[PDB]
């Protein structure tokens, strides 16, 4: 149920492991300190307009 509302507050991917939200990101992104946001790791990250 954890990812069913507001995507678990994740910017990108949301999963549930041992009854807690785990966020993750696409290749070329890294998880921010807060464990929710996805920060590009370089120029021209995937899925962004130029």
């Amino acid at each position: 149920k954890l990812c069913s509302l507001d995507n678990g507050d994740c910017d990108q991917f949301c999963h549930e492991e041992q009854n807690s939200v785990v966020c993750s990101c696409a290749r070329g992104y890294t998880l921010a300190d807060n464990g929710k946001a996805c920060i590009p790791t370089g120029p021209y990250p995937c899925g962004k307009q130029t």
Binding site: C3, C46, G47, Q49
Partner: protein, 232 residues
């Protein structure tokens, strides 16, 4: 693309155009990385030999930002057949890498179970291409895009006497005259999630274009994420 609108600068940067031996665009593709383009398996049977153009916005004019890449290898799905159009997916490895720049950037690959549950359940996606602007119409010299609603599975299956499989999905309109069309084949269907675009479909087939009670059929990318990863 039937209806919709022209892509603005920066807007559709993952669009690729497959060009045949006569230099005519005949299918689209989606940039996945510096070396790999996603397209439809059926596109491979439209031209013996072809190349891939990126950064193209206007097919009749030189821009100074567009580039043509030759294909090193074609990776076609083993289970595609012309009889079913099932497994309509291929990956192209380019001979020389793409330099990402204005109007040239990759779409994100989604993550399977998350995308099935959260991305495919969005109201709409966006399809883009240089294909015909109506059934029997001329191709577009300008890159176009169109917002298309996801169609529920039962309405989808009932729309055709052809078998629409679990590896396909429908998007578009019942009667509104907007759809993808011939020449958009192989191109991107993307879905936005929180300001990031994920490639969710490959333009595959329709019964004509924009017909009443007919939808666009797309290869379901989530059904092939491991296959794509292995191919790349």
């Amino acid at each position: 693309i039937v209806g919709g609108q022209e892509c603005k600068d920066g807007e559709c940067p993952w669009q690729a155009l497959l060009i045949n031996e006569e230099n005519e665009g005949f299918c689209g593709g989606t940039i996945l990385s510096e070396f790999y383009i996603l397209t439809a398996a059926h596109c491979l049977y439209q031209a013996k030999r072809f190349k891939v153009r990126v950064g193209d916005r206007n097919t009749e004019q030189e821009e100074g930002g567009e580039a043509v890449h030759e294909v090193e290898v074609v990776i076609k799905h083993n289970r595609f057949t012309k009889e079913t159009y099932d497994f309509d997916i291929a990956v192209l490895r380019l001979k020389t890498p793409i330099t990402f720049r204005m109007n040239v950037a990759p779409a994100c690959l989604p993550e399977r179970d998350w995308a099935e549950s959260t991305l495919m359940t969005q109201k709409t996606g966006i399809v883009s291409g240089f294909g015909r602007t109506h059934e029997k119409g001329r191709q577009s010299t300008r890159l176009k895009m169109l917002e298309v609603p996801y169609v529920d599975r039962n309405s989808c299956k009932l729309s055709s006497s052809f078998i629409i499989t679990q590896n396909m999905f429908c998007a578009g309109y019942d009667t509104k005259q907007e759809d993808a069309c011939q020449g958009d084949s192989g191109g991107p269907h993307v879905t936005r999630f929180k300001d990031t675009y994920f490639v969710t479909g490959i333009v595959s087939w329709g019964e004509g274009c924009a017909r009443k009670g007919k939808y666009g059929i797309y290869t379901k990318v989530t059904a092939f994420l491991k296959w794509i990863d292995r191919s790349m």
